[PDB]
């Protein structure tokens with residue numbers, strides 16, 4: 001029955017608290033530069049209207065689309081044009097174009113103040129008003145991460161409240177809190193980047209691209225499931241993801257809850273690992289299901305060669321329904337190989353497709369396709385060889401030195417990219433060494449390829465907004481499945497014209513001496529990028545000499561009596577020695 005008030009329905013389904021949270025998240029993601037207490041006022045107006053429609057669904061306006069109602073609140077914001085410029089032009093449109101226009105203005109790098117955890121203040125805020133404290137967390141994250149997957153953010157906010165519940169009772173609040181914040185922050189940044197990649201997949205490559213990624217991932221998690229159980233779940237899951245990517249946050253959350261319930265009702269057909277998820281309350285249940293471990297591969301699965309290489313009829317089977325035959329290939333390959341990266345499984349399925357396209361046209365197709373697994377294996381061997389070599393490099397240098405080796409590599413590949421992005425991306429890539437290299441053998445390929453696909457996606461999302469390198473545009477737009485190898489294959493960009501030495505990056509005031517370590521690292525890594533932008537062909541030894549003099553010089557002026565005097569008067573010596581080392 002379609003005679004439904006949508007707002008009433010979502011309020012009925014989700015409950016007041018989650019409804020309010022999701023509405024607050026929607027406003028914070030679309031209007032990232034509005035204060036908390038202004039969005040709270042809008043949430044409260046829409047909650048009062050929802051409750052009116054719950055009481056009486058025939059009440060005037062209860063029949064508007066939820067998204068239409070929300071858009072209307074946006075366009076009634078007095079400071080819309082003033083703060084968001086021509087985002088206010090979006091107000092002239094009809095749905096769904098109005099919404100697509102709003103989504104166009106979400107800012108991926110709003111460069112908002114860095115949140116410093118002050119444990120004494122936060123514990124006071126928390127004790128003062130817990131709900132406010134909860135909403136302030138949803139607002140601060142959502143406005144920094146405007147594609148953050150909204151129901152997961154509700155889950156993280158409950159865990160964030162739990163952290164303060166335990167830690168505020170301690171004597172040293174700081175010692176309890178800070179390691180937990182740190183843990184949270186890494187999990188929330190990864191989560192943001194994961195959902196950002198799902199949104200950019202849908203938008204730039206079609207919803208079929210995301211479906212293929214999810215078929216591969218779900219078949220590895222739930223290897224006893226039938227192909228059509230996987231395609232049903234992937235279909236519902238992709239609709240949830242797309243709804244969240246399109247800002248339909250109440251519908252995304254409501255659908256997600258229905259999917260969690262479906263998976264728990266069918267847990268016998270899917271995975272034994274689901275049992276611990278399925279008695280949890282709804283947000284925790286869903287989270288637990290998304291993070292579930294790969295079930296054990298069943299015994300007795302026939303070898304892949306039986307259907308895909310050995311069988312006489314591969315071409316006939318393929319030609320009858322090419323898409324279904326390849327989806328089934330992907331599913332069969334993925335359930336069998338939890339130790340492969342999902343992107344490697346997609347690359348395997350693409351190459352299997354190209355082989356059949358080629359072989360099935362020949363006189364004797366079977367002699368040509370019988371050996372396809374030998375043609376495929378280089379797609380497993382190449383990433384395995386890269387992972388071994390990059391994890392060695394990581395163990396040789398440590399995380400910071402590995403970040404610096406990545407700075408050199410990426411600035412050579414993409415020297416037109418702005419310095420702060422080269423630094424951010426190289427720092428994130430270096431942390432993949434920390435996150436993955438010490439893992440069990442069967443987890444290293446999924447771990448490193450997954451993180452690379454998140455971080456290269458972040459580069460692609462930034463570069464889409466201000467494209468400066470043709471080679472980045474090619475790697476970012478050509479094919480999602482080959483994005484990571486496309487970047488690995490970039491060498492020194494030969495079209496790049498060097499800039500003059502940008503000496504501000506090698507000149508400091510005394511306040512450098514008391515920067516926290518992360519910030520000192522960033523100052524040094526920024527200089528390193530700038531070296532390469534001035535001298536793209538500089539040798540690793542030249543770079544090392546320079547950077548060694550650099551740290552020697554900062555060390556010396558930091559230990560001076562008159563620090564600023566040293567930096568200012570001795571500074572040009574560093575700048576001349578740097579130009580000599582590079583000559």
Ligand SMILES: O=C(O)Cc1ccccc1Nc1c(Cl)cccc1Cl
Pocket residue numbers: 020021024040043044129131132133134135136
């Ligand atoms: O209103 C309350 O009881 C707690 C409170 C205090 C300050 C600001 C907001 C809120 N609640 C609140 C929150 Cl935290 C999020 C969305 C909507 C509302 Cl009404």
Ligand SMILES: O=C(O)Cc1ccccc1Nc1c(Cl)cccc1Cl
Pocket residue numbers: 115116117118137140141144181184185186188189
């Ligand atoms: O730190 C970020 O950039 C976002 C983030 C994610 C998870 C947990 C905490 C934070 N930031 C954060 C901090 Cl560092 C302090 C107080 C309140 C918040 Cl939301």
Ligand SMILES: O=C(O)Cc1ccccc1Nc1c(Cl)cccc1Cl
Pocket residue numbers: 186189190192193424428451454455458
């Ligand atoms: O760490 C940063 O500030 C860069 C950044 C911005 C937005 C979202 C994620 C990230 N970093 C990041 C990424 Cl892109 C992937 C996995 C894990 C992390 Cl911490």
Ligand SMILES: O=C(O)Cc1ccccc1Nc1c(Cl)cccc1Cl
Pocket residue numbers: 208211212215230231232234235323327
């Ligand atoms: O068939 C595809 O294009 C990929 C795919 C993957 C998982 C689940 C379903 C599908 N196909 C599919 C699609 Cl793309 C749209 C609507 C319904 C279905 Cl069954």
Ligand SMILES: O=C(O)Cc1ccccc1Nc1c(Cl)cccc1Cl
Pocket residue numbers: 383386387388390391394429430431432433436448449452484487488
């Ligand atoms: O980065 C590359 O080109 C090689 C490669 C391929 C697949 C997966 C990871 C990696 N490299 C990689 C690894 Cl294996 C660990 C930490 C950081 C990086 Cl950049």
Ligand SMILES: O=C(O)Cc1ccccc1Nc1c(Cl)cccc1Cl
Pocket residue numbers: 397400401402404405408524525528543544545547548551
């Ligand atoms: O290794 C050092 O002590 C010199 C130094 C200081 C700051 C930043 C980088 C470097 N060295 C460095 C360089 Cl210049 C390039 C690739 C890898 C490394 Cl570890």
Ligand code: NA
Pocket residue numbers: 225226227228
């Ligand atoms: Na099946």
Ligand code: NA
Pocket residue numbers: 251255
């Ligand atoms: Na729906």
Ligand code: NA
Pocket residue numbers: 346347348350351
């Ligand atoms: Na391929």
Ligand code: NA
Pocket residue numbers: 488489490
């Ligand atoms: Na390479």
Ligand code: NA
Pocket residue numbers: 503504505506507508509
């Ligand atoms: Na300077």
